[PDB]
Write a protein that binds this ligand. Sequence first.
Ligand SMILES: [Cl-]
Length: 319
Amino acid sequence: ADISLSYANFPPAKTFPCVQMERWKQEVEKRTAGKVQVQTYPGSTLLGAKNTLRGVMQGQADIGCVSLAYHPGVFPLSSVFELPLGFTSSTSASLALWDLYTKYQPKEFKRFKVLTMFASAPSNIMTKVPVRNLDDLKGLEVRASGILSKILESLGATPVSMPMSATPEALQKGVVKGLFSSFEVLKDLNFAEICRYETETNTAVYPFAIIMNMNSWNSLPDDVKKVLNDLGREQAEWTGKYMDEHVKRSLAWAKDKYSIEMIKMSDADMQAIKDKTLPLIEDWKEKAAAKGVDGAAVLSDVEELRIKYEGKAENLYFQ
Ligand SMILES: [Cl-]
């Protein structure tokens, strides 16, 4: 190759942000006929959580993976995708996020080439004892942090912060009685052994951006830029599909091994959750306004994109 790019990624190799990174590498090397090579650095071996943004800006790495939620205030527009907005899959959230970015071109990313974006699967409640309604959450100790803790507090539950590593013992001791995370942990971290009741609240996702140093981007010939540009939407879709299938495999494994049960709360309970969490949306809108973003316009557009990628309404023909 004549062009060599380093790709920093903070989480462990086995996790979805790194898995998609490797697939992206494969497609870039193939589609450029070997003109570009990519060296990957999973698990914070080049840049980690503390220095991916600055590190990419400085060229310490050519490319890096950012979890937007870890940098409050830095992404006033794209952070909308941290909120409880009703997304029910990684695929739909990933594609909606990419579309929103492409539409708005927010200045929060002006220092970088944004190579792709994607989102986690939605956060759900996984517990030792079934949570079938909101009364079941009252006073319930659940491992959570950030916005998910805020949501639990608003629902009358008891969010507890603690390291993922300490959570198994904590669960067994009753220090927490479940966790608020995406379903892949049921298999990947064997949480299904302990938490065999999974309540699908589809609460929120975590959005990510793959960013590239502008000098590095500038250096690429036009044919290479086209390859990377074309991969933006493709990689958003690929990552979401990978993640949704990875969740599907987690759940099937857990059902086969421990007979886990999938639970949905009533429509009335789901509306109560919305009503109780509306302040988080209002907070975000004030934050957006303070940085010159039209928060209501963005939220409207997000729902339009959600329906585009998920819509459950029946065909007009049958209405
Ligand atoms: Cl390198």
